[PDB]
Amino acid sequence: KKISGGSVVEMQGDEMTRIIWELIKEKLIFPYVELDLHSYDLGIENRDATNDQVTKDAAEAIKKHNVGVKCATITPDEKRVEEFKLKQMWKSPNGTIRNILGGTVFREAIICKNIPRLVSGWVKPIIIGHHAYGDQYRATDFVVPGPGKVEITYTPSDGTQKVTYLVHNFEEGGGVAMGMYNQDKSIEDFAHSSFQMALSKGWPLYLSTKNTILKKYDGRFKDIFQEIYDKQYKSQFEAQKIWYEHRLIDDMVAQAMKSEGGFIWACKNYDGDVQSDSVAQGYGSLGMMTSVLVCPDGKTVEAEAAHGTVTRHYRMYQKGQETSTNPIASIFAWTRGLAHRAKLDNNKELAFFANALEEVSIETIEAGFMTKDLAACIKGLPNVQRSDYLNTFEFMDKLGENLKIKLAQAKL
Amino acid sequence: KKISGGSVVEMQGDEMTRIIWELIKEKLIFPYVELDLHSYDLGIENRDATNDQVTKDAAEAIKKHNVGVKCATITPDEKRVEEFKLKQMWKSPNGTIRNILGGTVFREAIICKNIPRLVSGWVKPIIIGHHAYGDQYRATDFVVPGPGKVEITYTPSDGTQKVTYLVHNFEEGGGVAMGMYNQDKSIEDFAHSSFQMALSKGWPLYLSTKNTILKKYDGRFKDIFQEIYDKQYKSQFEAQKIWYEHRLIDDMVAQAMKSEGGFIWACKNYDGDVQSDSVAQGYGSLGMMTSVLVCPDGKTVEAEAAHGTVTRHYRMYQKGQETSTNPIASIFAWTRGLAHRAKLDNNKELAFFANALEEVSIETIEAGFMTKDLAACIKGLPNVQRSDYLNTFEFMDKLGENLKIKLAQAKLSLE
Ligand SMILES: NC(=O)c1ccc[n+]([C@@H]2O[C@H](COP(=O)([O-])OP(=O)(O)OC[C@H]3O[C@@H](n4cnc5c(N)ncnc54)[C@H](OP(=O)(O)O)[C@@H]3O)[C@@H](O)[C@H]2O)c1
Ligand SMILES: NC(=O)c1ccc[n+]([C@@H]2O[C@H](COP(=O)([O-])OP(=O)(O)OC[C@H]3O[C@@H](n4cnc5c(N)ncnc54)[C@H](OP(=O)(O)O)[C@@H]3O)[C@@H](O)[C@H]2O)c1
Ligand SMILES: C[C@H](Nc1ccc(C#N)n(C)c1=O)c1cc2cc(Cl)ccc2[nH]c1=O
Ligand SMILES: C[C@H](Nc1ccc(C#N)n(C)c1=O)c1cc2cc(Cl)ccc2[nH]c1=O
Ligand SMILES: [Cl-]
Ligand SMILES: [Cl-]
């Protein structure tokens, strides 16, 4: 009787999201879908036990099966080394996985009619993608201890004359200096992933840069996107009545603020971390922010929540205290992964199910059943009372009962 | 009869803001205050006629008199060179003035109870400052045409060991590469200006950086701020029950979103342009965003609106079409400049007037009289009808009429 789901790579994670992840599987997925799960435990102590090889193996399995669904993981810092007695500060699994796959991470906010938006006008979500988590990760920085010239040079491999550019002549005192870069192939992958994302959604695409200032650096992004668009995607976009345009970031922000949402935005910038995005943080609930890593081909995806492991809630849970952890972004990591699996395999039953679970999630909240973070979006955190929300387990139970009702009603 | 205002440097500007600037002077300032105005025409044609010397002269007058009030100016690009047949693409006057004063531009949103808030919890405004408009302006960028090494080198003037750092080895294909820098003195000015701004407001200060990634580059900002704080400001902050703390930008954004506002934020970042700040663009109109250039000594200020010259409205004005240009940020450039003048001179009458004009501006909007941009904030742009707003001239007349009423009532409340 269960839906034949097919091959899905699953990456288990840490702390509160690891608890919610199991509730999702037990209550929302496994009662209705049978899957050929290729499970990789990306929990912090199994990552330490395999010297982070499990992360690389999981990344390779996604490349092989084209569908990944990942739970939030701990990115180690020095406290985590003291906490778990780690071998070394293992790098972010999110960073390791998208490096190995060569994809673009697109973020999307899950919208509910009763949850106020930062901008009232935004009727459809805005999907934003960044170039390999931002240029901040491709920087080489140092202290200039005193006077002297800082220069950036390019020495051709073919033996042609080197080109030197003056960064700054420090005439008196010191300062700081740094070098950043991008490879053409990485920009091309970013363009292809962005065009594929726009065609799969049936929404227009904008690329934003600061090409008025970084005329050469940002100009290259504008040129590569336009070249790829004209040659390969223009007719396909026209057929769906969508378009692609470059925008100076100044105009893009003003435009996005006056729009109704419903577009893809390839944002060329320095910091692609969701944590430092004031609009992502201003929505009031990181629990509603999902992410999808899309590839140039448009055939491989890895879906995960944009939020972290929710350590503060995990500490309450460890003491037997009630929590109200929002599972929506984690649920949409499963629905987005399953929707892609269903598309690749022409599995109408799995496609129907994946959409129904997203609908049930939104309808539950729209009917006034929600976690504390969402009740705080409506009333303001100081005005929230216990009767305004459901705890983590009550909310999962409500979704499970509404999903059973949705699928029972559908049989007719 | 009129208030003796004292010495104020005035910089006239361009397009729609120049029109509003004159309406402010005629209707809101000159009927009540007498000023020793040191006027500099920073209009695009006069800047071109003096080869941008007027900009430098204005900056020097600000240093002497300590109070500047500036109108929005055109920053020339290739289209403007063609438009006005300019001799060269003159640099941003805002950038030139900031560079001469060694100041930091702090932005503040003007709040009206009836204009919806972006974050409900923000009961007090957040004042944000950037480092010399962001590092994007201190970049040297180029195309890497093909395979090869990109390296960044430092060659000491004293002849000691040259240090080379690999930016990237381009093995297959090309790409792009760039170098950015900051001078210590510029970071020190930024720290001093930020500490002075926090002390003058009586609000705590946060510096944000990405020092987890740019450990050397951003670490230098954290170190310079802490050094200066401990050496010249800790006791003064402690006396006012305020504090200074560095924050990783990730934590600062989460903290700011859960706060009540009421703090100064020195934001170390790449792009300090207001027009690419989603929060500045997300709340109200840029007509409600004012700015103040503050200097390391905490004595000199230059106030101006954070928005531009509003060229789209100027084109409507040039063709006799009605406009609805918000003058609030420009008015607050005058009130903030005059409030500083009053503080420096202990001029209670000018301090009282500057505050009364800010109150009249906010009260007018709160009583339902506003420009189209503000009516669209409340109703949503599609639902705005002509009867929901006042045109540029009607709004200035209403403010003028309400200012006359405010000052008449103040006199009648005496005895
Ligand atoms: N922050 C990120 O986006 C992120 C991404 C990947 C990995 N990580 C890892 O996650 C771990 C914890 O990071 P963190 O605590 O800084 O960030 P976090 O897990 O995203 O939690 C920060 C706070 O946001 C709220 N929150 C986040 N997700 C929520 C949800 N599903 N439902 C309800 N509230 C939610 C909670 O606020 P209240 O405390 O007000 O309830 C929570 O304490 C770290 O080890 C980090 O390496 C973080
Ligand atoms: N000195 C400065 O403070 C400064 C700052 C920024 C730019 N600039 C210069 O100003 C010129 C115009 O640049 P820009 O168009 O990007 O900037 P802008 O003048 O800020 O105008 C952009 C748009 O923002 C809205 N807007 C801004 N201020 C407004 C106000 N007072 N009332 C109502 N709406 C307002 C309008 O939107 P709608 O079109 O939807 O009505 C306007 O078209 C350029 O020459 C630029 O260099 C100078
Ligand atoms: C992916 C995310 N999407 C949304 C965030 C918040 C809200 C609200 N309210 N909505 C509707 C989004 O779609 C997003 C949007 C965004 C928009 C602008 Cl103008 C600037 C930065 C943004 N960053 C985001 O992460
Ligand atoms: C100077 C400006 N201040 C305000 C903008 C918008 C609103 C609203 N609503 N308020 C209250 C401000 O104080 C500002 C704040 C800001 C805050 C965050 Cl979290 C991020 C970026 C910001 N940029 C701004 O320009
Ligand atoms: Cl950025
Ligand atoms: Cl930035």
Short mmCIF file of all heavy atoms in Angstrom, two decimals, chain B residues 18-37:
data_model
loop_
_atom_site.label_atom_id
_atom_site.label_comp_id
_atom_site.label_asym_id
_atom_site.label_seq_id
_atom_site.Cartn_x
_atom_site.Cartn_y
_atom_site.Cartn_z
N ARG B 18 17.15 70.15 -4.48
CA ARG B 18 17.47 71.57 -4.50
C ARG B 18 16.15 72.39 -4.37
O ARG B 18 16.07 73.36 -3.62
CB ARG B 18 18.17 71.95 -5.82
CG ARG B 18 18.98 73.22 -5.71
CD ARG B 18 19.67 73.62 -6.99
NE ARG B 18 20.28 74.94 -6.81
CZ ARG B 18 21.57 75.21 -6.57
NH1 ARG B 18 22.47 74.23 -6.53
NH2 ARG B 18 21.97 76.46 -6.40
N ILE B 19 15.10 71.95 -5.05
CA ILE B 19 13.81 72.63 -4.97
C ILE B 19 13.28 72.55 -3.53
O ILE B 19 12.92 73.56 -2.95
CB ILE B 19 12.80 72.02 -5.99
CG1 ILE B 19 13.24 72.27 -7.46
CG2 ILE B 19 11.39 72.59 -5.72
CD1 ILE B 19 12.53 71.34 -8.49
N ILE B 20 13.25 71.35 -2.95
CA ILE B 20 12.82 71.17 -1.57
C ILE B 20 13.70 71.94 -0.57
O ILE B 20 13.18 72.49 0.40
CB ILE B 20 12.75 69.66 -1.25
CG1 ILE B 20 11.38 69.15 -1.73
CG2 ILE B 20 12.99 69.36 0.25
CD1 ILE B 20 11.31 67.81 -1.89
N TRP B 21 15.01 71.98 -0.81
CA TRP B 21 15.96 72.69 0.04
C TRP B 21 15.56 74.18 0.17
O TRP B 21 15.51 74.71 1.28
CB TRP B 21 17.37 72.57 -0.53
CG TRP B 21 18.45 72.98 0.40
CD1 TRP B 21 19.23 74.09 0.31
CD2 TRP B 21 19.01 72.19 1.45
NE1 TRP B 21 20.20 74.08 1.28
CE2 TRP B 21 20.12 72.90 1.97
CE3 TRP B 21 18.71 70.92 1.99
CZ2 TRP B 21 20.89 72.41 3.03
CZ3 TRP B 21 19.45 70.45 3.06
CH2 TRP B 21 20.54 71.18 3.56
N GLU B 22 15.23 74.83 -0.95
CA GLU B 22 14.80 76.22 -0.94
C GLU B 22 13.45 76.38 -0.25
O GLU B 22 13.25 77.37 0.46
CB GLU B 22 14.75 76.81 -2.38
CG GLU B 22 16.12 76.91 -3.02
CD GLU B 22 17.12 77.70 -2.20
OE1 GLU B 22 16.74 78.79 -1.70
OE2 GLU B 22 18.25 77.20 -2.00
N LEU B 23 12.53 75.41 -0.43
CA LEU B 23 11.23 75.49 0.27
C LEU B 23 11.44 75.41 1.77
O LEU B 23 10.73 76.08 2.52
CB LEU B 23 10.27 74.37 -0.16
CG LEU B 23 9.76 74.41 -1.59
CD1 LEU B 23 9.01 73.13 -1.93
CD2 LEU B 23 8.83 75.58 -1.81
N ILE B 24 12.41 74.57 2.22
CA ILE B 24 12.70 74.42 3.65
C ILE B 24 13.20 75.74 4.20
O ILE B 24 12.71 76.19 5.23
CB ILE B 24 13.70 73.25 3.92
CG1 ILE B 24 12.99 71.90 3.66
CG2 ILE B 24 14.24 73.31 5.36
CD1 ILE B 24 13.92 70.73 3.43
N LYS B 25 14.16 76.36 3.53
CA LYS B 25 14.74 77.62 3.97
C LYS B 25 13.70 78.73 4.03
O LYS B 25 13.59 79.42 5.05
CB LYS B 25 15.88 78.03 3.05
CG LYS B 25 17.11 77.10 3.18
CD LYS B 25 18.33 77.67 2.51
CE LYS B 25 18.16 77.98 1.06
NZ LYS B 25 19.44 78.39 0.43
N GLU B 26 12.90 78.86 2.97
CA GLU B 26 11.91 79.92 2.90
C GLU B 26 10.77 79.72 3.90
O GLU B 26 10.38 80.68 4.54
CB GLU B 26 11.34 80.03 1.47
CG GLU B 26 10.30 81.15 1.30
CD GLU B 26 9.54 81.13 -0.02
OE1 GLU B 26 8.94 80.08 -0.35
OE2 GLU B 26 9.53 82.18 -0.70
N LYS B 27 10.22 78.51 4.03
CA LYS B 27 9.05 78.25 4.88
C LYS B 27 9.32 77.79 6.29
O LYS B 27 8.51 78.05 7.19
CB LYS B 27 8.13 77.22 4.21
CG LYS B 27 7.57 77.74 2.88
CD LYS B 27 6.84 76.69 2.10
CE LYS B 27 6.48 77.18 0.71
NZ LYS B 27 5.69 78.45 0.70
N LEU B 28 10.40 77.08 6.50
CA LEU B 28 10.63 76.52 7.83
C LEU B 28 11.76 77.15 8.62
O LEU B 28 11.66 77.16 9.85
CB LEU B 28 10.83 75.00 7.72
CG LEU B 28 9.75 74.24 6.90
CD1 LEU B 28 10.09 72.74 6.76
CD2 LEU B 28 8.35 74.42 7.51
N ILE B 29 12.83 77.62 7.98
CA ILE B 29 14.00 78.14 8.72
C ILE B 29 14.05 79.67 8.81
O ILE B 29 13.96 80.22 9.92
CB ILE B 29 15.32 77.58 8.09
CG1 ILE B 29 15.28 76.04 7.90
CG2 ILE B 29 16.54 78.00 8.92
CD1 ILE B 29 15.09 75.22 9.20
N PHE B 30 14.17 80.35 7.66
CA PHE B 30 14.37 81.81 7.62
C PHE B 30 13.27 82.65 8.27
O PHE B 30 13.63 83.67 8.86
CB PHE B 30 14.63 82.31 6.19
CG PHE B 30 15.89 81.80 5.52
CD1 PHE B 30 16.05 81.92 4.14
CD2 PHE B 30 16.96 81.32 6.27
CE1 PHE B 30 17.24 81.54 3.53
CE2 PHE B 30 18.14 80.90 5.65
CZ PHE B 30 18.28 81.03 4.29
N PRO B 31 11.99 82.24 8.34
CA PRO B 31 11.03 83.08 9.07
C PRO B 31 11.30 83.12 10.59
O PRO B 31 10.82 84.04 11.24
CB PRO B 31 9.68 82.43 8.76
CG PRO B 31 9.91 81.54 7.56
CD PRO B 31 11.32 81.07 7.73
N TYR B 32 12.03 82.13 11.15
CA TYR B 32 12.27 82.02 12.60
C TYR B 32 13.70 82.14 13.07
O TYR B 32 13.90 82.45 14.25
CB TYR B 32 11.71 80.68 13.08
CG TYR B 32 10.28 80.50 12.61
CD1 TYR B 32 9.99 79.66 11.53
CD2 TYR B 32 9.25 81.28 13.11
CE1 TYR B 32 8.68 79.53 11.04
CE2 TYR B 32 7.94 81.18 12.63
CZ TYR B 32 7.66 80.28 11.61
OH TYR B 32 6.37 80.19 11.13
N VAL B 33 14.70 81.86 12.22
CA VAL B 33 16.12 81.87 12.60
C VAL B 33 16.91 82.78 11.66
O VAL B 33 16.65 82.78 10.46
CB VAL B 33 16.71 80.42 12.56
CG1 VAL B 33 18.13 80.37 13.15
CG2 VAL B 33 15.80 79.44 13.30
N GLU B 34 17.88 83.53 12.21
CA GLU B 34 18.82 84.36 11.45
C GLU B 34 20.11 83.61 11.55
O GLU B 34 20.54 83.27 12.66
CB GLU B 34 19.00 85.78 12.05
CG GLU B 34 17.96 86.75 11.52
CD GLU B 34 17.99 88.14 12.12
OE1 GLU B 34 19.05 88.53 12.67
OE2 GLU B 34 16.96 88.84 12.05
N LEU B 35 20.73 83.32 10.41
CA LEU B 35 21.96 82.55 10.41
C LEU B 35 23.08 83.26 9.70
O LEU B 35 22.85 83.95 8.72
CB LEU B 35 21.70 81.21 9.69
CG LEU B 35 20.85 80.20 10.42
CD1 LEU B 35 20.32 79.17 9.46
CD2 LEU B 35 21.63 79.51 11.52
N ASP B 36 24.30 83.02 10.19
CA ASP B 36 25.51 83.45 9.53
C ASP B 36 25.81 82.26 8.57
O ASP B 36 26.56 81.35 8.92
CB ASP B 36 26.62 83.70 10.58
CG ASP B 36 27.99 84.00 10.01
OD1 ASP B 36 28.06 84.63 8.92
OD2 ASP B 36 29.00 83.61 10.65
N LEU B 37 25.12 82.23 7.39
CA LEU B 37 25.28 81.13 6.43
C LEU B 37 26.53 81.27 5.59
O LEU B 37 26.70 82.27 4.89
CB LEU B 37 24.06 81.00 5.48
CG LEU B 37 22.82 80.30 6.02
CD1 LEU B 37 21.78 80.18 4.93
CD2 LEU B 37 23.15 78.92 6.59
#
